[PDB]
Design an enzyme around this catalytic site. Structure first.
Site, mmCIF file in Angstrom:
data_model
loop_
_atom_site.group_PDB
_atom_site.id
_atom_site.type_symbol
_atom_site.label_atom_id
_atom_site.label_comp_id
_atom_site.label_asym_id
_atom_site.label_seq_id
_atom_site.Cartn_x
_atom_site.Cartn_y
_atom_site.Cartn_z
ATOM 1 N N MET H 25 8.506 -14.421 -31.566
ATOM 2 C CA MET H 25 8.492 -13.222 -32.396
ATOM 3 C C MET H 25 7.830 -13.467 -33.747
ATOM 4 O O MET H 25 7.123 -12.593 -34.260
ATOM 5 C CB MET H 25 9.921 -12.716 -32.602
ATOM 6 C CG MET H 25 10.628 -12.265 -31.333
ATOM 7 S SD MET H 25 9.967 -10.731 -30.652
ATOM 8 C CE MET H 25 8.856 -11.355 -29.393
ATOM 9 N N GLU H 80 -2.976 0.351 -31.129
ATOM 10 C CA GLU H 80 -2.721 -1.057 -31.395
ATOM 11 C C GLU H 80 -2.396 -1.772 -30.091
ATOM 12 O O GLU H 80 -1.744 -1.208 -29.208
ATOM 13 C CB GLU H 80 -1.561 -1.204 -32.380
ATOM 14 C CG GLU H 80 -1.119 -2.633 -32.638
ATOM 15 C CD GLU H 80 0.057 -2.709 -33.596
ATOM 16 O OE1 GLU H 80 0.428 -1.661 -34.166
ATOM 17 O OE2 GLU H 80 0.610 -3.813 -33.776
ATOM 18 N N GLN H 82 -0.813 -5.415 -28.370
ATOM 19 C CA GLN H 82 0.040 -6.571 -28.609
ATOM 20 C C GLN H 82 0.210 -7.346 -27.311
ATOM 21 O O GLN H 82 0.314 -6.749 -26.239
ATOM 22 C CB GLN H 82 1.415 -6.151 -29.144
ATOM 23 C CG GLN H 82 1.371 -5.416 -30.469
ATOM 24 C CD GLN H 82 2.724 -4.855 -30.863
ATOM 25 O OE1 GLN H 82 3.666 -4.860 -30.071
ATOM 26 N NE2 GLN H 82 2.826 -4.366 -32.094
ATOM 27 N N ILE H 83 0.243 -8.673 -27.411
ATOM 28 C CA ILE H 83 0.363 -9.534 -26.240
ATOM 29 C C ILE H 83 1.315 -10.673 -26.557
ATOM 30 O O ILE H 83 1.316 -11.210 -27.670
ATOM 31 C CB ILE H 83 -1.008 -10.079 -25.782
ATOM 32 C CG1 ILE H 83 -1.865 -8.912 -25.287
ATOM 33 C CG2 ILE H 83 -0.838 -11.148 -24.708
ATOM 34 C CD1 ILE H 83 -3.054 -9.312 -24.456
ATOM 35 N N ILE H 85 2.734 -14.060 -24.227
ATOM 36 C CA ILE H 85 2.905 -14.869 -23.029
ATOM 37 C C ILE H 85 3.970 -15.912 -23.331
ATOM 38 O O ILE H 85 3.869 -16.637 -24.328
ATOM 39 C CB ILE H 85 1.583 -15.529 -22.595
ATOM 40 C CG1 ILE H 85 0.504 -14.465 -22.375
ATOM 41 C CG2 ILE H 85 1.791 -16.347 -21.329
ATOM 42 C CD1 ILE H 85 0.855 -13.423 -21.327
ATOM 43 N N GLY H 93 -4.299 -19.567 -19.178
ATOM 44 C CA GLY H 93 -5.239 -18.477 -19.318
ATOM 45 C C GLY H 93 -4.680 -17.096 -19.067
ATOM 46 O O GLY H 93 -5.457 -16.137 -18.990
ATOM 47 N N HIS H 128 -9.178 -16.644 -31.818
ATOM 48 C CA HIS H 128 -10.322 -16.950 -30.964
ATOM 49 C C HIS H 128 -10.207 -16.252 -29.614
ATOM 50 O O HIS H 128 -11.213 -15.793 -29.056
ATOM 51 C CB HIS H 128 -10.449 -18.461 -30.775
ATOM 52 C CG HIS H 128 -10.993 -19.179 -31.970
ATOM 53 N ND1 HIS H 128 -11.845 -18.582 -32.875
ATOM 54 C CD2 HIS H 128 -10.808 -20.446 -32.409
ATOM 55 C CE1 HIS H 128 -12.160 -19.449 -33.819
ATOM 56 N NE2 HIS H 128 -11.544 -20.589 -33.561
ATOM 57 N N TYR H 130 -8.999 -13.403 -29.148
ATOM 58 C CA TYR H 130 -9.404 -12.020 -29.376
ATOM 59 C C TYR H 130 -10.906 -11.914 -29.624
ATOM 60 O O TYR H 130 -11.563 -11.007 -29.101
ATOM 61 C CB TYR H 130 -8.638 -11.429 -30.561
ATOM 62 C CG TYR H 130 -7.132 -11.508 -30.437
ATOM 63 C CD1 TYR H 130 -6.517 -11.553 -29.193
ATOM 64 C CD2 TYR H 130 -6.327 -11.543 -31.567
ATOM 65 C CE1 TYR H 130 -5.142 -11.629 -29.080
ATOM 66 C CE2 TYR H 130 -4.954 -11.618 -31.464
ATOM 67 C CZ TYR H 130 -4.367 -11.661 -30.219
ATOM 68 O OH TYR H 130 -2.997 -11.737 -30.120
#
Lengths: 164, 166, 166, 164, 166, 166, 164, 166, 166, 164, 166, 166
Positions: H25, H80, H82-83, H85, H93, H128, H130
């Site tokens: 977060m 907007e 947001q990601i 993982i 990847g 990077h 993005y």
């Protein structure tokens, strides 16, 4: 003598007119369409919304404009500022006073750490008004808004309390 | 002739005027922002709230201020007191009368055991008005509040029933 | 000509005044604090409450007081009685008439088997007004209430129907 | 080992049985009629009622009774006390323990100034249990309750904190 | 390995056990009475209450306690802190870990300016645990609470971010 | 060993059966049609209805019938009584026991002054079962009900408390 | 000229007065206590209640009384009838007219099969008014009601459509 | 084989975990505190919210992350992105695939004219990731957020559809 | 052995099957479309609707059909009747039994004065089954309904109580 | 053997999958995003909506597709028809059967006067399926929908009952 | 000049007057009883009821009557028609105008296929007014209604669009 | 001077009139029936409906008409346009001005990609008024509507933004 006072239900009539003027709303990327009933329902909806502080800019005789501290975040301690002076009363410096008072409220009362705003790149008037108060351009969001039938670039400007 | 009476819905118009004055709300660490509709909804919300007793301070002619016993706890038998006399009617001793009447209400009617309050360490006027009634400084909370763009300390003062009537 | 009628919403204002007079409430151990809005909400709340019968005591010209049959229990067939005549109209015997008519209502209409009341042990006026109608002291609850900054004892007095008809 | 613990929804089953026993409810002028649904609705209704404190008297193995501090007034600082031990578990002094713990709760926790109770004049058992703890008869309310087809006199007894 | 995580509805069964222990609630001036249903309704009530952050203190094997940041004010940027480590797991340093993690959460995540707490003047254990972290006594509120049938004084202690990280 | 207990939601199924038997309902002038859902909604509707006391009549093994004190008026102090013993368990005297216990409940617990009932003029069995307990015929309402494709007269019978104690 | 017309909210004021007069309510075993607010809430509650038909007896100038067909059962096809003429307007036969019109409504409009009523045994006035219209005493319910501090016997009278 | 699907209520548990990990977060300036009940209430609240499209990123075996198109404005035609993982599945990847599929959804299905995002100026990895897809830095908001006890600057980056098709 | 009983919520699964069969609903001018949830909401809606009496027709082993008295008017004392015996159980005389039992219920329990029904002029089977019970054709409503893509006439048939029992 | 049956809550799972497949929704200009919770709330919302008739196309073993008569207008007597057969079961003529049954329902049961549909101009498959049943192209709405990142033309086709 | 317009809330005062006239409601088998509040609640209830079209019949000066298309079925495409011209304005041909305008509205706007009505067999005036417009008697429902204390037969009359415009 | 403003509740009365004129509605295939209460409920219902933008067309003196952008889809970026100028003010060119301003609003403010409309094939006046602004016929929906007792064909016309700027 000029003052800022909390927005009241009784003032929504004024806020109605402003919100339905094309020239005013366009410069702030808003839509010039809002029934008085919808405006009243929205006022009631956000009555207890602590993320907003909507004021009224009033001169020695009548109400002249509105100024809003919105998106008030109390973790990151920042908020967006919006100012709208009715063109009828443009010519007397009400915008600069309202801006200064709103900044003082945000910093000294709401204990905010940073203030920011979006201003149309072509709105050199408001841009200079903001730069006079210490706001610095932090970003240029191209084609961020659509108005008058075209995408317009917007300066993301801001001011820190440390700088104020 | 001065009196304290229950706060009425019809009185909110006056309270509104006081809740939006920067000078008044500042000394009490409150925010000078409140729509009349918000004040009305809050009055309706706390209508049955027994932790609060909001009196209006009235004189021979008109309303002059508001004195409130809030945070009324009935297990520990203590409550906070707040006074706000409108500056227009300042210098007439209304503050002392209202404060003493509120102390009497708390000790003799609500059967409270202790009363307390927070006062800005710079407001020597209020500190003296409170000391005159028997309130004694029990704490100094530094940077406890934030007003006028600065962190302000606050004296926690209080008065016991045993000290007030022995 | 004096009468008792049902309490109406339009009468609440009168009640409001009485409910905020410290002198009137203290003798009945009540608190002299109640906003008009709270009284209206309470009237609406107990509108269908069959455990209560609140009457207004009216004289030839205007309303003068209130009488109440509360805590009406229909299994044990008893109820508490309360009376309050505004001091403005005191000394004219309204309280005795209201007490008599309320007793008659409780016994003859509600079919009550017993009526009871709490009265401050010092309030000898009310005590004698009750004893005149046959109410006899059945208990002395010491320090049963708290008012005027002191714990107060109270006579639990009562009258049976068998004593009222005899 | 005996204890008092807050009343729980899960215990209402027990409280149901007690509330529908004639012999028990009669001595306390209650009506021996109450559906489990009504009992649950009443529990939910008074969930936030700060004028009541309903407990459960539990021994080393199971629940044995109930004890309630009701009509809790925080201005005059007094409350009524009611105790009901199931006859199955009568014979072991649970009532005296529950009474003592309820008095301690009322005085030392709720900060009460006086406790009172109504006891049938013929219930010399409970009368003596109460007198052992310092309760003194303050009144004799004749024909105050109706049960078993007759009006019964009730002793109004009480205990001050100063006396305890 | 020890951690603090958000309080979950499924955790209330544990909190219930702590909210009904006289010894635990006493030191925190709370009342040892709360039905599981009441606790659940309260959790649901404050589900969206941003003035509160109730963490559960868990160890390598199971839950051990609860640490709460309550009365979170975002204008004055201060909040009260409360710790309760179940006695079964006492003497293992869980209290210090939970308190320090809560201080870090308040200063570094909630962006609080000051933290404060009330502690019984006799609980020298807790007073020392708090002083070790930097909390300094700012007030002595005499007879501020009532527990075990006696009025108890309370140290108002606090810690500033400026004092914690300079 | 036979007993009367309070009607429970879990018992409604039994009631449902009884409420759909034409033979059982016709004698009581009711309609033999009621979905289980309607009965449950009616139970929930009258859950707090103090004008009704619906008891289940249970024997040594299972539930055998229902008895009811309805139209309970607390001013006039009377109520209607209804009884239904499933024909499967008829002939064992359950109806008389249920009637006696219901009368005792009405007089000794509810403090009723009078009990009354409607019974088909042809139902001589129920008429004698009622007369045994002291219920005397006070009225003959001709063509008062409609069942089995015919208008039926009904005896209005009743028993006073003064006759029950004498 | 006299008429019967459906009860209206606007008439509740009148109905209020009647319902709070001791002499009137007593003869009909009612309680002379009812706030106007309670009367209005009751009117709203039974607005769609098809078991009731409350009318107003009106003369050539003003409203004089009330007449109600209550407990309307559509299976057994019967209903109770109640009539109350304000004593101010007693002296002009309004009760007989209202009774006749109510009977005609019950039989010819509601398709009722039988009408019944309870009348105080001492109320020989109303008793004779009813007997004049064909009502016959079917029962004498002793101590069926309590009023004026005593239990009073009530005649259960009725009239069949076949007899009318 | 990797895919993006709509966020389901049954998935909230996974989300819950992610929403309580401080490491995950903090980089997105969020607070690592959220009870499962609050997350469920928020899912129900925004169920019909057309301004948001929350997708789950799933791999060949299990759910691995979340992607979100929020603040979807249909007049200015932007939103907007947001990601997140989960670190357990990082380095494979998944983030690039999720970013590409979310951009495709925004441009080709929602008909968006522009996409934008906030990223910590120190998070060079995400920056990077993005920039590889064509997102160009349009602003540097200094001290725009507060996390890990420090004010943090953020790049406002974005990608137009005209740049995505070119 | 055959019977009619009240329609139960648990029976809707059967009714559903009948409400979606084109052949069955067609002869009754109904639409063969109704989700189980819609049927349940409708059952709940008409739970207290006294204008309807929906009986299920059951045999020695299982449910076979449904017979309904709808549009029950209590002023004119008439109601419409509808029968639907599932084709699987056709040719066993269930229709005649159910129809006659429903006639008896309407005349002898509901105290109806007249019964009526609409039947397709081509369904001579149903017309004969109805004529056998005493129903007489009172009208021919041409093109009154629309089914199978054509406007269909309908015999309005009816039976009076006076004609059924004299 | 194939059939059409009313849509049920229990089938929404299937309808969920279809509604979240890109290839399927795209050809019908729908958005391939819908949580099961939203689908259930929408099913409940339109439970009593008489403007819609949503069916399920089921073969001898399992459910294969969906067919909907929406925008049912009962004044102009027309409605839009939509058909979606899952690609897994494409290869067996289920679409033609579902279309024929839906047309028969609309005309012979709902008493509709005209049916219409929108089909992507590039979807020559569905176009020919519709033309086989008598549907005739009445319009070509260019750039009427946006999918796969481009504006697509749509044939507005329809069929009158007189022609059927 | 005469017209038909939608029924308005403000018009209910007129409708009320008509709904309580015995002579008017009788010929239409209605009950002459309806409080203004009931009429208003019913108007609000059917505000969005598309099965009804209640027109008010107005003349050159004032309202004269009401004509209603009720029971509008959109599958079978038929509806019932009801006319009520106040007797004060009788003998002026308003009934014929309103009826013909309503027929036109039903056939040409609502796209109805058939119109029908029930008329007392003794009201030869109305029967003739309806026959003049093309309505033909399709049924005689004997004792179908109950008014003026007697069971009254009713002609079911109707008119097809094909018969009205060919 | 002519203008377009947002539809206000206070304007509904005007709308009401227009919505009850058969001549005005028939050309737009609407039904000339709508009580004022229904219109107000519809205004309140769609108050927050972002799929609709209803403007009033006002001249120098008074309101003259209505224009509407309905079925606003923000994914496909198109919407239906409707215009109605009261016949009293027809012939003054108000319709063309309203159409132009509504097109400008749709394209320049709502960012619509296409506008479309339905127009009766016989209404050549409206057809030419639309063709003047660049709207081209893309479809001929035969028997698409029903009005004046006949099925009517309709041109589906439309204008792209690319054609409006070119």
């Amino acid at each position: 003598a000029m003052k800022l006072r909390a927005l009241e239900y009784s003032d929504l009539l004024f806020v109605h007119e402003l919100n339905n003027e094309y020239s005013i709303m366009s410069y702030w990327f808003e839509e010039p369409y809002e029934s008085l009933t919808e405006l009243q329902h929205l006022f009631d909806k956000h009555l207890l919304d602590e993320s907003e502080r909507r004021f009224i800019v009033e001169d020695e005789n009548q109400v002249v404009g509105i100024v809003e501290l919105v998106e008030i975040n109390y973790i990151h301690r920042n908020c967006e500022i919006q100012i709208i002076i009715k063109p009828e009363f443009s010519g007397k410096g009400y915008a600069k006073f309202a801006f200064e008072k709103a900044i003082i409220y945000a910093f000294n009362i709401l204990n905010m750490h940073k203030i920011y705003l979006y201003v149309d790149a072509d709105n050199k008037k408001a841009i200079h008004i903001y730069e006079s108060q210490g706001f610095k351009t932090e970003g240029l969001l191209k084609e961020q808004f659509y108005t008058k039938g075209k995408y317009k670039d917007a300066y993301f400007m801001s001011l820190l309390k440390s700088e104020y």
